[PDB]
Structures are given as structure tokens and as C-alpha cells.
Design a binder for this molecule. Structure first.
Ligand code: BCL
Ligand code: BCL
Ligand code: BCL
Ligand code: BCL
Ligand SMILES: CC[C@H]1c2cc3[nH]c4c(c3C)C(=O)[C@H](C(=O)OC)c4c3nc(cc4[nH]c(cc(n2)[C@@H]1C)c(C(C)=O)c4C)[C@@H](C)[C@@H]3CCC(=O)OC/C=C(\C)CCC[C@H](C)CCC[C@H](C)CCCC(C)C
Ligand SMILES: CC[C@H]1c2cc3[nH]c4c(c3C)C(=O)[C@H](C(=O)OC)c4c3nc(cc4[nH]c(cc(n2)[C@@H]1C)c(C(C)=O)c4C)[C@@H](C)[C@@H]3CCC(=O)OC/C=C(\C)CCC[C@H](C)CCC[C@H](C)CCCC(C)C
Ligand SMILES: COC1=C(OC)C(=O)C(C/C=C(\C)CC/C=C(\C)CC/C=C(\C)CC/C=C(\C)CC/C=C(\C)CC/C=C(\C)CC/C=C(/C)CC/C=C(\C)CC/C=C(\C)CCC=C(C)C)=C(C)C1=O
Ligand SMILES: COC(C)(C)C(=O)C/C=C(\C)CC/C=C(\C)CC/C=C(\C)CCCC/C(C)=C/CC[C@H](C)CC/C=C(\C)CCC=C(C)C
Ligand SMILES: CCCCCCCC/C=C/CCCCCCCC(=O)OC[C@@H](O)COP(=O)(O)O
Ligand SMILES: CCCCCCCC/C=C/CCCCCCCC(=O)OC[C@@H](O)COP(=O)(O)O
Ligand SMILES: CCCCCCCC/C=C/CCCCCCCC(=O)OC[C@H](O)CO
Ligand SMILES: CCCCCCCCCCCC[N+](C)(C)[O-]
Ligand SMILES: CCCCCCCCCCCC[N+](C)(C)[O-]
Ligand SMILES: CCCCCCCCCCCC
Ligand SMILES: CCCCCCCCCCCC
Ligand SMILES: [Fe+3]
Lengths: 302, 281, 242
């Protein structure tokens, strides 16, 4: 049953690749970790090294603090009982201050103050991680596309936790930190706003989320179908088109009448994915600030 | 019209049915026997939609809706205007989707490439069939399927979901969502990585795949690699649609309660069901 | 009725249309302008214009690439029209495997090896790659290679490895006459007792194009090799038994 190239047949191992140097401060690179044969069946077997500078340390510290602040609250909700902790783990919730406190930072610890403290830690962790994605690319002389795309995900997170609560007048509009509680929040959000299915920016966000799975299925399958001509070596196929790039393009031209280039498909890809959270963020931003009822708003505009 | 490099690929052969009878192109489009079959099912399905739009009495595309038969019709045939057009359109849509996949196979053969693409497309057909065929038949009526209208099929989604409480609690639905999110994350990362290597900082030469691996190792300590990322993209998108169909085929067939109940097993196990405090004691 | 939400959604649709026009033109940097089947430019190029040229500076002193630019196959194409009207197949005038047309096609890529980030050859035979070894799965080296006629064409004498990615790309196979050919990893099955190749019969292995150097393979050579092997799926089908 013909080789499908989904799993590697024969793994090979050589000395560890320590990576390109360019302008990277090599002081901050770790050593090499162990090779994983298990990972080697699907992708590369090598683990590490990793780069850990000031921003990465600041990010991991803030992130652990965020995690530990939620965990301490969860233990307190479980009356310090480990069995209650495991039993009710998905039900614990660190909720935002009640609406009475408005945007003040003066909520008592057990009445929303811990939420503000956790949110501060998560704010530092994500933004310093963002700075890291920019500086890691700059140190290798790369384009900044990864930082720009990350900003789109950051935008929706900023709208949910920070910009929309501020525009609403209350931290109590923000999202709680809990497995089940943030699902309940999501469902209540749609009900309170008159059915999010009728928010056109929600509809667009769904088309791009579906579209992202459509496109990666198409692109991943296409590349595997032309890997017998070295198609996954996409950079050199951009610099010097080979029969892999031509057959890939012709498959889609013959199928649906038009096609991409090896470079150009990755522009379709980045935009398809970043538009998910770009449109989503706008849809949430407008809910409650401008539109109270998406269904009723929908009926008066067709 | 041809792409500048296209001529040498436009050879005879590769068809599964019909020999050289349909082995030709219309513009960029390859035809083949299953191109003819696709056109047939598509044309007829679009005619029936037109017919049903007249019966409904509107030309507005946002209002046209072709409904399946009432639950009382069970799995039986229905009159055209009382659910029968929906039944015939579903046959045409199925015919067109399967014909499309087999036309893709013929294109694969003529070009000498792997069959991954029509294989991946088959998962989407399977998910469509889960909602209009497999699940309705297991529940005993065509009316459990969704209507064909831009906005009515969203109403169907909301109606079906809230029937079982907050559908969020369906555990296969959680896994599918995780794959959909992780896929869009991987797609953004992969498109960004390639473009950032092909289009580096001003004043720089093109980067190499080694720079892509170095970037991801510096960032998170691991690079899956150029082949692995395309395998991963395939696996993420297909697993998302697989668990999507799984989460619907079990709803209303082996599960009838609010989905939040499913976890309430974990809550009321006897060695902690009665411990006071927490959330569930 | 013109609230801020209506303004936003109308604005987004204008932006999306501009984005689509930009994306489509970016994807016309290769293969355009469209041609007629005789090679002259086509009258109808569509509603999107060609993009203005962009330049890539290739690493390691390999020059620059500007796209789009004047296109050329830079190889003879052994095919003939089978119809006055357009839309019909062009038929091989010779041996399509040897002439490299159809699914046996190759592209006139640069006759240079792909280089890694450090400027060394990206693909090397294992017997010249200090440190490299098989680490999991069946080591094929010394196994017999079998074609779709269930006859034996030779035996595996090396693996050609992608050094930067630590990946097996080609099996080097020694033929009955003592010469060797490269076989793409993606077109073989490593089994417990043999390597099976469905695309070729044993007697088409010697027609695999040969490389100029025992220790490197150029981009041009890889395309000729991979195109030939893949073309066996259509053109060696007579000799594909059971
Ligand atoms: C998958 C789970 C649910 C469901 C839940 C939702 C939800 C929830 C939403 C949609 C949305 C949409 N869905 Mg629905 N939808 C389902 C099944 C379908 C089927 C089908 C035959 O199975 C189709 C064709 C559609 C089609 C559509 C579009 C009208 C719209 C955006 C989709 C998109 O971009 O996807 C990704 C694909 C692409 C980007 C490629 C292009 C696909 C094109 C645009 C599809 C056009 C179809 C056309 C209108 C109908 C046929 C016309 C022929 C001439 C006969 N849905 C099932 C029942 N769907 C969203 C919306 O805005 O609805 C108004 C939305 O919010
Ligand atoms: C009853 C429930 C409601 C509903 C309520 C909502 C609400 C409320 C929201 C959505 C939103 C979304 N909905 Mg809806 N939704 C419903 C029905 C659907 C259906 C369906 C078939 O019925 C579908 C397919 C969708 C689909 C979607 C997505 C397109 C969109 C989220 C995009 C995304 O990637 O977010 C995931 C991505 C993020 C949240 C960004 C995260 C970025 C940050 C920076 C990550 C930090 C990581 C942190 C540090 C932890 C690190 C861990 C360590 C690495 C280990 N909805 C119904 C109508 N939906 C969102 C939206 O945009 O709406 C317009 C939204 O807020
Ligand atoms: C978009 C509209 C809603 C929303 C609706 C939904 C729905 C609906 C679902 C989820 C699901 C999940 N959501 Mg949510 N979600 C929202 C915003 C968030 C934010 C955020 C920063 O804003 C975060 C961190 C999460 C986090 C999560 C995960 C727990 C889970 C899978 C995410 C995923 O696929 O990541 C992709 C990224 C990765 C896989 C990389 C690794 C990420 C890790 C796993 C994130 C860890 C978070 C947290 C620390 C985990 C604690 C685990 C133990 C309990 C200690 N959501 C908004 C408010 N989310 C699904 C689920 O399983 O829920 C239980 C689900 O069904
Ligand atoms: C109030 C509503 C409920 C709810 C109820 C449901 C129900 C009910 C279902 C889902 C399903 C889904 N939900 Mg839910 N869901 C909710 C909230 C969410 C949230 C969220 C952020 O809160 C998210 C992210 C999701 C996510 C999802 C996905 C896992 C899944 C949809 C994808 C799918 O099946 O594709 C599958 C893909 C397809 C069906 C597309 C098939 C396309 C075919 C093959 C080709 C079409 C060709 C076209 C006609 C041709 C066009 C021609 C061109 C125009 C030229 N839901 C809330 C709690 N959800 C659905 C599901 O799993 O279905 C299996 C489903 O039915
Ligand atoms: C285009 C939209 C999609 C998107 C894109 C996107 N996300 C991104 C990026 C991009 C382009 C990045 O560049 C960035 C990244 O670095 O990816 C590798 C990121 C990323 N998106 C992430 C998550 C994420 N993205 C999501 C969504 C989306 N991301 C969209 C679908 C979701 C959800 C809910 O769907 C999640 C959960 C992270 C993997 C990463 C951002 C990392 C970050 O900000 O970290 C700050 C916090 C910490 C460093 C510490 C947190 C504390 C924890 C206890 C973990 C640390 C413990 C230990 C050190 C690690 C242990 C666990 C395992 C990883 C080993
Ligand atoms: C499995 C992973 C994802 C996936 C993959 C995927 N889809 C694919 C492929 C792949 C690999 C293709 O090769 C194929 C393609 O050619 O893409 C360009 C396809 C494709 N996926 C498409 C759509 C699509 N895929 C979707 C989803 C997904 N596709 C998954 C998430 C969705 C949604 C809602 O998520 C949609 C809308 C098409 C662009 C294309 C299939 C084209 C096709 O089949 O053409 C033949 C059919 C016609 C020309 C018309 C038939 C008309 C009917 C007779 C009448 C209308 C019936 C319909 C039920 C009415 C619906 C009304 C709606 C409002 C509900
Ligand atoms: C690395 O690689 C990669 C590339 O490449 C380098 C790529 O590109 C791509 C491809 C990806 C992209 C281009 C990115 C953009 C794509 C998306 C965003 C995905 C979303 C897709 C869409 C929204 C487009 C979908 C459009 C579709 C589905 C096609 C629409 C269909 C039609 C308009 C017609 C369909 C044609 C049919 C039915 C088949 C048969 C053809 C006919 C016309 C019918 C037959 C007609 C007849 C019977 C007449 C016969 C006449 C006779 C008898 C007389 C003789 C005739 C003669 C004159 C000869 C990927 C993934 C890739 O990773
Ligand atoms: C044994 O247990 C120990 C103690 C070790 C543990 O650590 C246990 C740990 C756990 C059990 C982990 C539990 C963690 C979770 C359940 C995480 C679940 C979280 C979510 C589902 C997140 C949902 C969405 C979160 C959002 C939207 C956050 C928004 C953040 C804001 C954008 C930040 C806004 C900033 C503010 C308000 C501060 C203002 C200050 C400035 C300087 C601006
Ligand atoms: C206040 C918090 C929110 C901040 C802003 C939210 C919205 C941000 C949206 C971001 C998406 C940007 C497009 C993603 C793809 C990027 C394609 C591109 O071309 O990017 C420009 C970049 O190549 C320029 O050259 P380099 O920087 O050298 O790479
Ligand atoms: C009312 C209107 C509201 C919205 C306003 C704009 C609407 C019209 C705009 C449509 C076109 C959008 C094009 C976005 C992409 C542009 C990217 C670009 O040209 O610069 C980035 C540059 O580094 C090149 O990318 P790389 O080569 O990858 O670094
Ligand atoms: C210590 C090791 C722990 C590792 C934990 C990982 C952190 C979580 C991220 C997951 C997203 C993975 C998706 C990978 C997306 C890569 C984008 C891409 O194109 O990579 C191809 C390859 O890397 C080109 O060299
Ligand atoms: C970058 C790729 C572009 C894909 C375009 C997808 C179009 C989907 C349109 C969905 C319509 C949503 N809504 C609410 C405006 O009707
Ligand atoms: C929903 C997103 C799809 C947008 C489709 C963009 C269509 C591009 C058609 C370009 C025509 C190319 N052609 C045939 C002239 O070579
Ligand atoms: C959203 C609908 C997209 C359909 C685009 C089809 C365009 C086919 C191009 C071939 C023209 C000759
Ligand atoms: C009277 C029974 C017909 C109802 C429609 C069934 C859906 C057809 C599925 C695909 C069959 C080829
Ligand atoms: Fe790619």
C-alpha cells in the first residue's frame, strides 16, 4: 500500500544542530537536550537548544506567577483538601470583581482583587513573550511576520479581558479564569447580546476559522503529494521553481481554475489565520458598547 | 490559455473511466468523466433550488430555505414541497461532492502526484454525511438534518445545541474545538515562518530553512521541521473534522441528556461525592 | 440606520476586496502571462494585472531572482498537438520517460546543489556525513531492491541524507552492472527483507538519470531523477504485475 509519507520510514541521526548564529547572543542559548525517537517518526527528533534572555525569563516568571495565583485560589476554594481539589478542578473559577467596584483596583482579595493580580501577571507574560518573538526574528535577520501575526491573537485577548471591560465601565465584564466557568461565560455572552450567530463579524470569524482548516488541509496534503519531488523545501522552490511547485500549481488550476505560487500560498495562509482573531476581536469589541442585540440589529439591516 | 510551464504536463492518460472520451480541458479546467458528472449533479441541484425558491415565493438569496421533511415522515419519501426537494438536493449534493473527489484522483494520476488531497477532502464529505445521512438515519427521521438556507442552518445549529444544554460540555466537541484552534495557530505560524525567511530584513539575503529551524528552537526549544509541519497541518485539520463528526454522531443516539451531566459522573464518584465544601460537596 | 457597526462591516468588506486583489496578484509572479498552446501570449489574461517585479537576493553569492520576468522552459518539449482547437492533450512524440514529459516531466533548475545555512551541500551520502547513522526503523543498506515486475534490480549501498533536517531523502542503489542510481525515499517501501519500488520495473532502473558526482546531487539532477521515477506510475504500467 504505496508509501504515503505520513510517518518516517527510516530515521537517521547525526551530531546535534547548534543552529545559525547571525547576531544571536550565544550566551543565552541552552545546551542541547535529548533526541526523541518518538518525535522522530513525525518530524525532527532534536530537542533544544532554547534561547533564554531577559525577556524570556521575565515572561516565564510572570506566567508562572499567573498560574500559581490561580492555583492558590483553587486550593482555597477546595478548602485545602487535595481530594476536593482533584474532584472539582474543572469547576473552580477565579472571577473578576463584582460590577459595584467598576474599574477600581480596590476590590478585596477574595472579591476580585486576586483576579486583578493574576491578570497583571498574564499581561506581563504575554507582552514580553511578544517582544521575544520580535527580537528572536531580528537577531536572525528575519522578517517580522511572526510578531505581526501574534499581535492578531493578542488583539482578541486584549479585547476580551481589557479593552471591552474598560469601555463597558467594569472589570466584571472580563473573562473568569476557570475551565468550565469561561465556557459558561462564553455562552452567557451570546445570550445577553441577542445571539452571536447574528453578529456579522462572528460569521466572518467562523468563515476564516473553517477556511483555515480548509486551507491547511489543502496545503499540507498538496505538499505531501509533491514531496516525492522535494516539494517541502519551499524556500529553494521559491528561489528556483521545480517540478514540485509546477505540479502543485497545476493540480489546483485544473481542479478549480486558478492557483498559487510557492511563496504566495503562504500569504493566503497567514491572512486566512490572522483574520480569525482580527474579525473576532472587532465583533466582541462592538458587543454591548455599540450593539446590545445582534438579532434585532440584524433585522433592521437585512 | 496555459501557464508558461504548463504544456509539457498536458498529456493524455490517467482517467479512471471513459478512456480518452472526456480527456480534455475547458480553459484551465480539466474535465474528465467526473467533471461531466459534477456538472450534471450541480446543474440539477441548482435547478431544484430555483424550483424550491419559486414555491417559497422569493428571489432573495438570504431568505431561500429548503427544509427537510417533518419528523412524522420518518425515514420515508416526502412530497417535493413538503421535504422532497431537500431529499433530492441532498442526493445531488452528495453526487457532486463524490464526483469532485474522483475528478481530483484523475488529476493526481495525470500529474503523477500522491492522492493526499482527495483523501483529505473525503473527511469533509464524511462530516457532511454525518449530519444529513448517518445521524438522521440513526435517529429515525430525515427532519433531524439541517435545512439549506444561509440563516436557517444557523438556527438549526442553535436549536440542536441548546436541546442538550450548553453543547460546550460535549467532550468530543471540546477536542474538535481544540484541533480547530490549534490548526489556525499552526497555519499562522507556518505562513509567517516561510515569509519571514523569503522576505528578510531590508539589506539581507534570503534566509535558509536552517534559519527557520533556529528561529523556532530559539523561541520554544523545538522545530518540527519542513516536512513535519505539513504533516502536522494535515493531521490537525483532519482530526478537527473527525472529532466534529464524532461529537455529532453520538448526540441523540447514545446520549440524550444535557452534556454537563457527562462530567457529573466525575463529580459523584462515591469516595468523594459527599465530602463537604468545594464546589460539589 | 448607519450606526458604527454598519460602518465597520461595510469598511471590512472594502478592505477584504483589496486584500483579495493583492493576494491574487502576488500569486501571479510565476507562470504568467498566460500563453496560447502555440506559445504566443494569450489575448485574455484576466482582470488582474501582473505584479510589479520584486527581487530576492540569494544567499552564498548565488545572485538575485526577479519575478515576474521573461519566462522560458530552457529545454525541448517532445510533444505534438492532437487538435486544431485548444483544450486537448498534447501527445508524446517519443519516449515520454526518456524525453521527460507528462508525469515524467522535470524542470530546468540550476545545475547546482542546494546549500545549507553554512554554505555546505545540503544533501550528502551517509558514507561521507560524519556522525550520521540509522537510528530507528529498518536499515535498508544491503537490502535487495525489487521492482513492480517482482524482479530484483540491485541492492542498497548508501543513504543520501538531508544534513540540516536529519532526514533520509534518497536510497543509492547499485545495479547489476555496478553503477548506482538515486531513488527518492518517498517512492520506496522499506520492508523486512527488501526494498519494494512500485513505480518502476527492474529493467527501467538503469534509465534513471545519473549524477555527475559521487558525493553531491544538483537541483537539476534531483528534478530529472524524481520526475523519471514518478513517471513510471503511468508509463511503466504495462510491466506492473498482479
Ligand atoms: C459545519 C457545521 C455546521 C454549520 C455551521 C455554520 C456556522 C455556525 C456558520 C456557518 C457559516 C457559513 N456556512 Mg455553514 N454549517 C454547516 C454546513 C455548511 C455547508 C455544507 C454543505 O455542509 C455549507 C456549504 C455551508 C456554508 C456556509 C457559508 C454560507 C458560511 C461561511 C462558510 C465558510 O466560509 O466556510 C469555509 C469555506 C471557505 C472560506 C471557502 C468558500 C466556501 C463558500 C463561501 C461557500 C458558499 C456556499 C453557497 C452560499 C451555497 C451553494 C451555492 C450553489 C450555487 C448552489 N455550511 C453545518 C450544518 N456555518 C457562517 C456564516 O456566516 O453563515 C451565514 C457561520 O457563522
Ligand atoms: C453559546 C456560544 C456562542 C458563541 C460565543 C462566542 C464568544 C463569546 C466568542 C466566540 C468567538 C469565536 N467563535 Mg463563537 N459562539 C457560538 C458558536 C460558534 C460556532 C458554532 C459551530 O456554533 C463556531 C465554529 C464558533 C467559532 C468561533 C471562533 C471563530 C471565534 C474564536 C476565534 C479563536 O481562535 O479564538 C481563540 C483565540 C484566542 C482566545 C486568542 C488567545 C491569544 C492569547 C494571547 C493566548 C494566551 C495563552 C496563555 C498565555 C496560556 C499559555 C499556556 C502555555 C503555552 C503552556 N462559534 C455560539 C453562538 N464565540 C470569539 C469571537 O471572536 O467572537 C466574535 C468570542 O470571543
Ligand atoms: C473564543 C471564545 C472563548 C473561548 C471558548 C472556548 C471553547 C468553547 C472551548 C475552549 C477550549 C479551551 N480554551 Mg477557551 N475561549 C476563550 C479564551 C481562552 C483563553 C484566553 C487567553 O483568552 C485561553 C487561555 C483559553 C484556554 C482554553 C483551553 C483550556 C482549551 C483549548 C485551547 C486551545 O485549543 O489552544 C490551542 C493552543 C494550544 C493547544 C497550545 C497549548 C495551550 C494550553 C493547553 C492552554 C492552557 C490553559 C490553562 C493554563 C490550562 C489548565 C490545565 C489544568 C486544568 C491545570 N481560552 C474565549 C473567552 N475555549 C476548549 C476546551 O477544551 O475547553 C475545556 C473548548 O471546548
Ligand atoms: C449554540 C450552538 C452551540 C453549538 C452547537 C453545535 C452543533 C449542533 C454542531 C456544532 C459543530 C461544530 N462546532 Mg459547536 N456549538 C457551540 C459553540 C462552538 C464554539 C464556540 C467558540 O463557542 C466553537 C469553536 C464550536 C465549534 C464547532 C466545530 C467543532 C463544529 C463545526 C465544524 C464542522 O463540523 O465542520 C464539518 C465541515 C463541514 C460539514 C463542511 C462540509 C462541506 C462539503 C463537503 C462541501 C461543500 C461544497 C459547497 C456546497 C460548494 C460551494 C461551491 C463554491 C461556492 C464555488 N462550537 C454552541 C455551544 N456545534 C457541528 C459539527 O460537529 O458538525 C459535525 C454541529 O453540527
Ligand atoms: C492567528 C490566530 C491564532 C493564534 C496565533 C498565534 N498564537 C501565537 C503566535 C501566533 C501567530 C505566536 O507567535 C505565539 C507563539 O510563541 O507560538 C509558538 C503564540 C502563542 N499562542 C499560545 C496559545 C494560544 N493561542 C491561541 C489562539 C490563537 N493563536 C489563534 C487560533 C489559543 C487558544 C485559546 O485558541 C491559545 C491557548 C501560546 C502557545 C503562545 C504564546 C506564549 C505566551 O504568551 O506565553 C506567556 C506565558 C508563559 C511563557 C508562561 C505560562 C505559564 C504556564 C504554566 C506555562 C509555562 C510552564 C513551562 C515553562 C512550560 C510547560 C508546558 C509545555 C509547553 C511544555
Ligand atoms: C476536512 C478539512 C476541511 C476541508 C478540506 C477540503 N475541502 C475541500 C478540499 C479539501 C482538502 C478540496 O480538495 C475541495 C476543493 O476543491 O477545494 C478548493 C474542497 C472544497 N471544500 C469546499 C467548501 C467547504 N469546505 C468546508 C470545510 C472543510 N474543508 C474542512 C474544515 C466548508 C465548511 C462549511 O467548513 C465549506 C463550505 C469547496 C470550496 C470545495 C468542494 C467543491 C465541490 O465539491 O464542488 C462540487 C460541487 C459543486 C460545484 C456545487 C454543488 C451544489 C449542490 C448540488 C447544491 C447546493 C447544496 C448545498 C447542501 C446547499 C447548502 C446551503 C448552505 C447555506 C448550508
Ligand atoms: C504549494 O502548493 C500550493 C499551490 O500551488 C503552488 C496552490 O495553488 C494551492 C491552492 C490554494 C490557493 C490558490 C489559495 C486560495 C484558495 C482558497 C482560499 C481556498 C478557497 C477556495 C475557493 C473559495 C475557490 C473554490 C472554487 C471552486 C470550487 C471552483 C468553481 C467551479 C466552477 C466555476 C466550474 C467547475 C468545473 C467543473 C464542474 C468541472 C468540469 C468543467 C466544466 C466547465 C464542465 C464541463 C463542461 C462541458 C460538459 C462542455 C463540454 C464541451 C464539449 C462537449 C465540446 C468540446 C469542448 C472543447 C472546446 C474542447 C495550494 C493549497 C498549495 O499548497
Ligand atoms: C498544585 O497546584 C498548583 C498550586 C501547583 C497550581 O499551580 C495549580 C494550577 C492550576 C489548577 C491552573 C489553573 C489555570 C487555569 C484553569 C487557566 C484557565 C484560564 C482560562 C480558561 C483563561 C480564560 C481567558 C483569560 C483572559 C481573557 C484573560 C484576560 C487578561 C487581560 C487581557 C489582562 C488585562 C490586564 C489587567 C486587567 C491588569 C491591568 C494592569 C495593567 C498594568 C494594564
Ligand atoms: C492594542 C493591541 C492591538 C494591536 C493591533 C491589533 C491588530 C494587528 C493586526 C495584525 C495583522 C498584520 C498582518 C499579518 C501578516 C503580516 C504581513 C506583512 O507584510 O506584515 C508586514 C511586515 O512583513 C513588514 O516587514 P517586516 O516587518 O520586515 O517583516
Ligand atoms: C474604508 C477602508 C477601510 C480599510 C482601509 C484599507 C482598504 C484597502 C486595502 C487593501 C489592501 C491591503 C493590503 C495588505 C497587505 C500589504 C503588505 C505590503 O505590501 O506591505 C508589507 C511588506 O512588508 C511586504 O510584505 P513582505 O514582503 O512579506 O515583508
Ligand atoms: C521544550 C520543548 C517544548 C516545545 C513546546 C512547543 C510550544 C507550544 C507550541 C506549539 C505550536 C507548534 C506548531 C509548530 C509550528 C511551526 C511553524 C513552522 O512552519 O515550522 C516548520 C519548521 O519548524 C520549519 O523549520
Ligand atoms: C482571505 C480569504 C477570503 C475568504 C472569503 C470568505 C467569505 C465568507 C463570507 C461569509 C459571510 C459572513 N457574513 C456575516 C458577512 O455574511
Ligand atoms: C473566497 C476567496 C476566493 C477568492 C478567489 C479569487 C479568484 C482569482 C481568479 C484569478 C483568475 C486567474 N486566471 C484564471 C486568470 O489565471
Ligand atoms: C467565493 C466564490 C469564489 C469562486 C471563484 C471561482 C473563480 C474561478 C476562476 C477561473 C476563471 C477562468
Ligand atoms: C426517499 C429516500 C431518499 C432521501 C435522501 C437520502 C440522502 C442520499 C444520500 C446519498 C445517496 C447516494
Ligand atoms: Fe508550506
Amino acid at each position: 500500500a504505496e508509501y504515503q509519507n505520513i510517518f518516517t520510514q527510516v530515521q537517521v541521526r547525526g551530531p546535534a544542530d547548534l543552529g545559525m548564529t547571525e547576531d544571536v547572543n550565544l550566551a543565552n542559548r541552552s545546551g542541547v537536550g535529548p533526541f526523541s525517537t518518538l518525535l522522530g517518526w513525525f518530524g525532527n527528533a532534536q530537542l533544544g537548544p532554547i534561547y533564554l534572555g531577559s525577556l524570556g525569563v521575565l515572561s516565564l516568571f510572570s506566567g508562572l506567577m499567573w498560574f500559581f495565583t490561580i492555583g492558590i485560589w483553587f486550593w482555597y476554594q477546595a478548602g485545602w483538601n487535595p481530594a476536593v481539589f482533584l474532584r472539582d478542578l474543572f469547576f473552580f473559577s477565579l472571577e473578576p470583581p463584582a460590577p459595584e467596584y467598576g474599574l477600581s483596583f480596590a476590590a478585596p482579595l477574595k472579591e476580585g482583587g486576586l483576579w486583578l493580580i493574576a491578570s497583571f501577571f498574564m499581561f506581563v507574560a504575554v507582552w514580553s513573550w511578544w517582544g521575544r518573538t520580535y527580537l528572536r526574528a531580528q537577531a536572525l535577520g528575519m522578517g517580522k511576520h511572526t510578531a505581526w501575526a501574534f499581535l492578531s491573537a493578542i488583539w482578541l485577548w486584549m479585547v476580551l479581558g481589557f479593552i471591552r471591560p474598560i469601555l463597558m465601565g467594569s472589570w466584571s465584564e472580563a473573562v473568569p479564569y476557570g475551565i468550565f466557568s469561561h465556557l459558561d461565560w462564553t455562552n452567557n455572552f451570546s445570550l445577553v447580546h441577542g445571539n452571536l450567530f447574528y453578529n456579522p463579524f462572528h460569521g466572518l470569524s467562523i468563515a476564516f476559522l473553517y477556511g483555515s482548516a480548509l486551507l491547511f488541509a489543502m496545503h499540507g496534503a498538496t505538499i505531501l503529494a509533491v514531496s516525492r519531488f522535494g516539494g517541502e523545501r519551499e524556500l529553494e522552490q521559491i528561489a528556483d521553481r521545480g517540478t514540485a511547485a509546477e505540479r502543485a500549481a497545476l493540480f489546483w488550476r485544473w481542479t478549480m481554475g486558478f492557483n498559487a505560487t510557492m511563496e504566495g500560498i503562504h500569504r493566503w495562509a497567514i491572512w486566512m489565520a490572522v483574520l480569525v482573531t482580527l474579525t473576532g476581536g472587532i465583533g466582541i469589541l462592538l458587543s454591548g458598547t455599540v450593539v446590545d442585540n445582534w438579532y434585532v440589529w440584524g433585522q433592521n439591516h437585512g | 490559455a496555459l501557464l508558461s510551464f504548463e504544456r509539457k504536463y498536458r498529456v493524455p492518460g490517467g482517467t479512471l473511466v471513459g478512456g480518452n472520451l472526456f480527456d480534455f480541458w475547458v480553459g484551465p479546467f480539466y474535465v474528465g468523466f467526473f467533471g461531466v458528472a459534477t456538472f450534471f449533479f450541480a446543474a440539477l441541484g441548482i435547478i431544484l433550488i430555483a424550483w424550491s425558491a419559486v414555491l417559497q415565493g422569493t428571489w432573495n438569496p438570504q431568505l431561500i430555505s429548503v427544509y427537510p421533511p417533518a419528523l412524522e415522515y420518518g425515514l420515508g419519501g416526502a412530497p417535493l414541497a413538503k421535504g422532497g426537494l431537500w431529499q433530492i438536493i441532498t442526493i445531488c449534493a452528495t453526487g457532486a461532492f463524490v464526483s469532485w473527489a474522483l475528478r481530483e484522483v484523475e488529476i493526481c494520476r495525470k500529474l503523477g502526484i500522491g492522492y493526499h488531497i482527495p483523501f483529505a477532502f473525503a473527511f469533509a464529505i464524511l462530516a457532511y454525511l454525518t449530519l444529513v445521512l448517518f445521524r438522521p438515519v440513526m435517529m429515525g427521521a430525515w427532519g433531524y438534518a439541517f435545512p439549506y438556507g444561509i440563516w436557517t442552518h444557523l438556527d438549526w445549529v442553535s436549536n440542536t445545541g441548546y436541546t442538550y444544554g450548553n453543547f460546550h460540555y460535549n467532550p468530543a466537541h471540546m477536542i474538535a474545538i481544540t484541533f480547530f484552534f490549534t490548526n489556525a495557530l499552526a497555519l499562522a505560524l507556518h505562513g509567517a515562518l516561510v515569509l519571514s525567511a523569503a522576505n528578510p530584513e531590508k539589506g539581507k539575503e534570503m534566509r535558509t530553512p536552517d534559519h527557520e529551524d533556529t528561529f523556532f528552537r530559539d523561541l520554544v526549544g523545538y522545530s518540527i521541521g519542513t516536512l513535519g509541519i505539513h504533516r502536522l497541518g494535515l493531521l490537525l485539520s483532519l482530526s478537527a473534522v473527525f472529532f466534529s463528526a464524532l461529537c455529532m454522531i453520538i448526540t441523540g443516539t447514545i446520549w440524550f441528556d444535557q452534556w454537563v451531566d457527562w462530567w457529573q459522573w466525575w463529580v459523584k464518584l462515591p469516595w468523594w461525592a459527599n465530602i463537604p465544601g468545594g464546589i460539589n460537596g | 440606520n448607519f450606526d458604527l457597526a454598519s460602518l465597520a462591516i461595510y469598511s471590512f468588506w472594502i478592505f477584504l476586496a483589496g486584500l483579495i486583489y493583492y493576494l491574487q496578484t502576488e500569486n501571479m509572479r510565476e507562470g504568467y502571462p498566460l500563453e496560447n498552446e502555440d506559445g504566443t501570449p494569450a489575448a485574455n489574461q484576466g482582470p488582474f494585472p501582473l505584479p510589479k517585479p520584486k527581487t530576492f537576493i540569494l544567499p552564498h553569492g548565488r545572485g538575485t531572482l526577479t519575478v515576474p520576468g521573461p519566462e522560458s522552459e530552457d529545454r525541448p518539449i517532445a510533444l505534438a498537438r492532437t487538435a486544431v482547437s485548444e483544450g486537448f492533450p498534447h501527445a508524446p512524440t517519443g519516449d515520454p520517460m526518456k524525453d521527460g514529459v507528462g508525469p515524467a516531466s522535470w524542470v530546468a533548475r540550476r545545475d547546482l546543489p542546494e546549500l545549507d545555512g553554512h554554505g555546505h551541500n545540503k544533501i550528502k551520502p551517509m558514507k561521507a556525513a560524519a556522525g550520521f547513522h540509522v537510528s530507528a526503523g529498518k536499515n535498508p543498506i544491503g537490502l535487495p531492491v525489487r521492482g513492480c515486475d517482482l524482479e530484483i534490480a540491485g541492492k542498497v549501498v548508501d543513504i543520501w541524507v538531508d544534513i540540516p533536517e536529519q532526514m533520509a531523502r534518497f536510497l543509492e542503489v547499485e545495479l547489476k552492472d555496478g553503477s548506482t542510481r538515486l531513488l527518492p525515499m518517498q517512492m520506496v517501501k522499506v520492508q523486512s527483507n527488501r526494498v519494494h519500488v512500485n513505480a518502476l520495473s527492474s529493467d527501467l532502473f538503469a534509465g534513471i538519470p545519473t549524477i555527475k558526482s559521487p558525493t553531491e546531487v544538483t537541483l537539476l539532477e534531483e528534478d530529472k531523477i524524481c520526475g523519471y521515477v514518478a513517471g513510471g506510475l503511468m508509463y511503466a504500467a504495462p510491466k506492473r504485475k498482479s
